[PDB]
From Swiss-Prot, chain A:
It comes from Schizosaccharomyces pombe (strain 972 / ATCC 24843). It comes from the Eukaryota. This is Chromo domain-containing protein 1. Ago1, chp1 and tas3 interact to form the core of the RNA-induced transcriptional silencing (RITS) complex. The RITS complex interacts with the RDRC complex via interaction between ago1 and hrr1. Clr4 has a role in mediating this interaction. Interacts with dri1. Residues 22-74 form the Chromo domain.
Length: 75, 18
């Protein structure tokens, strides 16, 4: 075998993470699984207008402001 | 810029079926 260590393949600098982050226009509705995962109907901006889909809260780590706003106004 | 929020979007997945 060869003995090599990992490289900094992932950037450590903060900047453009668009590849793993899309805009949250706002929440359109919500849902919860039986497995214990909560999901919301997100309108992702930056993408096509018809792209909106349900995503878990887990991906909404940045959209807590908008999500919690939703959950505040709607249960 | 417009002050707005963003989130991941799990872009990728596979349904385990045969």
């Amino acid at each position: 075998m060869v003995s090599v260590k990992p490289l900094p393949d992932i950037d450590s600098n903060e900047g453009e993470t668009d590849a793993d982050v899309y805009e949250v226009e706002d929440i359109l509705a919500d849902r919860v699984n039986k497995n214990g995962i909560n999901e919301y109907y997100i309108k992702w901006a930056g993408y096509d207008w018809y792209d909106n889909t349900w995503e878990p809260e887990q991906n909404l780590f940045g959209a807590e402001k908008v999500l919690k706003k939703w959950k505040k106004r709607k249960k | 810029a417009r002050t707005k929020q963003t989130a991941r979007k799990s872009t990728g997945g596979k349904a385990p079926r045969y």
